[PDB]
Amino acid sequence: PPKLTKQMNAIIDTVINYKDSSGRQLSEVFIQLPSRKELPEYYELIRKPVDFKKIKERIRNHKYRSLGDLEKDVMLLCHNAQTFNLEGSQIYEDSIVLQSVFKSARQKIAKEE
Ligand SMILES: COCCOc1cc(N2[C@@H]3CC[C@H]2CN(c2cc(-c4ccccc4O)nnc2N)C3)ccn1
Ligand SMILES: [Zn+2]
Ligand SMILES: [Zn+2]
């Protein structure tokens, strides 16, 4: 339904647009994965690569049957950032915050059970 798509887009836009107390947009690095030719090491280590552009494409093309499916893909993105990057590094830390930002956005926008 158009309502579900509106909610998914509103949730992902909250995640994308989020800035920390310093005004930095944390999603910046995660919008588009570097190409396989630029960073082959990433694709050698990460089995299911995904970025925010792909998640937007999947919402747009009606590929998520529920908000749970959308969540699964956002969590996979953050997991891959944490798998590839060192614990304590900025990319690693940013992905942890974005998991939390998605959950707050889902609770606020969707107002479920
Ligand atoms: C147009 O911009 C697209 C990205 O541009 C880039 C960015 C590159 N970077 C190198 C180091 C910093 C930045 C982002 N980097 C990473 C990106 C990601 C990543 C990006 C999107 C989605 C999930 C991810 O885990 N994960 N770990 C990284 N270390 C790779 C390397 C080559 N092209
Ligand atoms: Zn690049
Ligand atoms: Zn459509």
Q: Is residue 81 in contact with ligand 1, taking CB distance under 6 Å?
A: yes
What experimental approach yielded this model? X-ray
Proximal ligand: closest to the CA of 73: 1
Is the CB of residue 48 less than 8 Å from the CB of residue 80? yes
- Alpha-carbon span 60 to 53, nearest angstrom: 10
Domains and CATH numbers, the chain: 2-111 (1.20.920.10)
Is the CB of residue 7 less than 8 Å from the CB of residue 105? no
Question: Is residue 91 exposed (0-12), middle (13-18) or buried (19+ Cβ within 10 Å)?
Answer: middle
Tokens of 70: 């959308």
- Alpha-carbon span 53 to 31, nearest angstrom: 5
DSSP collapsed to 3 states, the chain? CHHHHHHHHHHHHHHHHCECCCCCECCHHHCCCCCCCCCHHHHHHCCCCCCHHHHHHHHHCCCCCCHHHHHHHHHHHHHHHHHHCCCCCHHHHHHHHHHHHHHHHHHHHHCCC
14 phi and psi angles, rounded to 5 deg? -60, -45
Q: Is residue 98 in contact with ligand 1, taking CB distance under 6 Å?
A: no
- Alpha-carbon span 51 to 80, nearest angstrom: 10
1 is in an annotated binding site: no
C-alpha atoms less than 13 angstroms from C-alpha of 19 in its C-beta half-sphere: 5
Kindly provide the resolution of this structure in angstroms, with one decimal.
2.6
